[PDB]
Write a protein that binds this ligand. Structure first.
Ligand SMILES: [Mn+2]
Length: 664
RNA sequence: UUCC
């Protein structure tokens, strides 16, 4: 099935991905890098006291608060769903090697027995109906850009003025670029408007990953994470190998003189892709309007904010099934990309824009440094984009693509195994749309709340209910995949967007409640994904702008966890043993300092006004903007706070751009 | 050195 072409950095095709400026050239050549992260100001993730603290705390919490998850994966009791050993990693030091991204996932999908297209006409109509409902009556809005984010290929600029210019120029020339692409002139579109080229692969830390303690040996065991070497990646797995990366941290002593306590490992690394900003801008200009529509009109299934917001919906259900999707981005099907583009064309979307969109989901990928002495290789030929990597994380609409795929996948699963009586309602496009429109508003006996690969499927009283229980049972048995599209299972310890669904003795949705995940509090406070970047003067540009603020939203976010008090007390006690200081006081000081620093960034904030006007969401986002990438959306954040993190392109320019893209 |  054809190996993907690959080119070394020295090749003109790779050289053309990096502009003649220092940042771009440095990004092209960056070698493998690792080191302790500055967990908080003046504290390294490998500080001996900190590791001693994590050692004591993880053992104590695991011992005293064993997971409470029943045979159907519902959590109850203490609200704990697994041991607390995930904190045992040397943050900043990755597993070796990281994976080479798969150039084609067609074989991966076929081998997993997943379909290479909609299986029935019903399904084809539902996927297309999703497109019609999602992309139809959009309202223009300013294109918002994350401060400090890189434009990646080819400029690698982090300057907001430059990013605004690139974005406006891109909206002005998107049409011309898309038409060149329609003509097969990809190099021309790339050379003239920087729309094309490749995604830039950056490996990110998943700071906590499963670790177990072998009762027999008393030794800890880290979860094996399988990685593909270059041969496997360019042949879609036909050749080369898939093997377990090494999370062994012993090497750190040998290599860096760092003491490694027993049971501490290197971090799981995941591939992330930064998109060529000039190509992403015209896509983002449409994506935001789409999010605004689905979060308003279809808020029921798509707009998720608080634990109570989720709770009110699930309470009305007779059955709630917490699903899990295996490796969603890598399994994402290219045929859905093509189905979507086709339907947008049928709807009247500008062909040149659809071509830009199609091309962003077929782009080559430049691999930086998966390990020492490896990398700096372009996979795929930019002159004719034809990769099938699945869903690229830096594509301007990745959340929407995952949501569209999965929402319909779950609905089909409900139709197939529980509601055949609803099939007659889906006869053509008009009826598919009316049915989906009703289903997405929570008006049918089968329902769902979802976001990309996380979801909870519900059944109210009715004919589908009995089928709902059979499906749940099938998932429990876990021998047969309920979907022809993705690998679906039930989540062990059902949760939705960070909140655990805590059931009581009845094990029914009506008497269940959503509570924060105490383990995530621990992940966030003691295993951040990034250091504090104390040398980046502009805090709004940091991955963690105001870490101290999270202390002020902690109670609101995690207060409902059954063992909240116990954990804060165990932390205080262990921190005392390790540092001879009070953790609470340490955090109160950090809270105070960051609160004062925040006023410097918020114009509508007195030169020392407190956090009075800010919401718990505002605070969590200021401490971790990444939660805006997977948990919340712009509309969930106070306006004066959103401005701290983002800057926008004029509404006049995006308005004129959208007008040329949309049908009506 | 990415994407609500
Ligand atoms: Mn879940």
């Amino acid at each position: 099935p054809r190996r993907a072409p690959a080119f070394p950095l020295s090749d003109i095709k790779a050289q053309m991905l990096f502009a003649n400026n220092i940042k771009a050239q440095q990004a092209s050549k960056r070698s493998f890098k690792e080191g302790a992260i500055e967990t908080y100001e003046g504290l390294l993730s490998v500080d001996p006291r900190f590791l001693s603290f994590k050692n004591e705390l993880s053992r104590y919490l695991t011992d005293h608060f064993p997971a409470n998850v029943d045979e159907y994966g519902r959590v109850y009791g203490n609200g704990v769903r697994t041991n607390f050993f995930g904190m045992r990693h040397m943050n900043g030091f990755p597993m070796i090697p990281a994976t080479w991204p798969l150039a084609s996932n067609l074989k991966k999908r076929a081998d997993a027995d997943l379909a290479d297209g909609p299986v029935s006409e019903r399904d084809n109509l539902l996927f297309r109906a999703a497109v019609r409902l999602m992309f139809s009556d959009l309202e223009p809005v300013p294109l918002k850009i994350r401060k400090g984010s890189s434009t990646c290929i080819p400029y690698f600029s982090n300057d907001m003025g430059t990013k605004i210019e690139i974005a406006e120029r891109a909206l002005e020339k998107a049409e011309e670029a898309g038409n060149l692409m329609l003509q097969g002139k990809f190099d021309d579109a790339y050379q003239l408007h920087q729309m094309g080229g490749a995604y830039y692969v950056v490996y990110r830390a998943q700071s906590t990953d499963a670790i177990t303690l072998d009762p027999k040996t008393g030794k800890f065991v880290s979860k094996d994470r399988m990685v593909a070497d270059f041969e496997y990646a360019v042949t879609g797995g036909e050749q080369g190998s898939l093997f377990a990366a090494s999370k062994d941290a012993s090497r750190l002593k040998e290599q860096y003189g760092i003491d490694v306590p027993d049971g501490f490992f290197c971090e799981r690394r995941r591939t992330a892709m930064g998109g060529p900003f000039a190509l992403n801008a015209p896509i983002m200009a449409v994506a935001q309007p789409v999010r605004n529509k689905i979060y308003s009109k279809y808020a029921y299934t798509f707009h998720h904010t608080t634990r109570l917001n989720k709770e009110e919906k699930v309470k009305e259900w007779s059955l709630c099934v917490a699903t899990d999707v295996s490796d969603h981005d890598t399994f994402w099907p290219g045929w859905l990309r093509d189905l979507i583009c086709d339907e947008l064309l049928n709807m009247g979307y500008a062909p040149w824009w659809v071509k830009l969109f199609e091309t962003s989901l077929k782009l080559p990928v430049y691999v930086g440094a998966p390990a020492p002495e490896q990398g700096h290789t372009l996979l795929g030929d930019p002159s004719n984009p034809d990769l099938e990597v699945g869903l690229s994380s830096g594509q301007g609409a990745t959340d929407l693509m995952g949501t569209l795929l999965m929402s319909i996948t779950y609905l089909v699963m409900q139709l197939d195994h529980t509601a055949p009586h609803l099939n007659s309602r889906i006869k053509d496009m008009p009826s598919a749309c009316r049915f989906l429109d009703s289903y997405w508003q929570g008006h049918e006996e089968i329902r769902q709340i979802s976001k990309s690969d996380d979801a909870m499927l519900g059944w109210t009283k009715g004919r589908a209910l009995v089928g709902g229980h059979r499906l749940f049972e099938m998932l429990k048995e876990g021998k047969v995949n309920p979907s022809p599209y993705m690998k679906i299972s039930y989540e062990h310890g059902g949760a939705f967007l960070g909140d655990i669904l805590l059931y009581d003795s009845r094990r029914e949705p009506g008497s269940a409640i959503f509570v924060g995940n105490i383990n995530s509090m621990l992940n966030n406070q003691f295993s951040p994904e990034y250091g504090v970047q104390s040398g980046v003067r502009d805090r709004s540009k940091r991955k963690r702008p105001f870490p101290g603020l999270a202390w002020a939203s902690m109670k609101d976010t995690y207060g409902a966890c059954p063992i909240y008090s116990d954990v804060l007390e165990a932390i205080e006690r262990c921190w005392w043993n390790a540092f001879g200081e009070s953790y609470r006081a340490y955090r109160e000081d950090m809270l105070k300092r960051d609160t004062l620093e925040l006023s410097r960034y918020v114009a509508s904030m007195a030169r020392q006004a407190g956090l009075a006007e800010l919401t718990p969401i505002d605070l969590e986002v200021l401490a971790d903007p990444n939660k805006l990438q997977y948990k919340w959306t712009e509309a969930d954040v106070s306006a004066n706070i959103h401005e701290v993190l983002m800057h926008g392109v004029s509404v006049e320019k995006t308005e004129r751009f959208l007008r040329s893209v949309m049908p009506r």
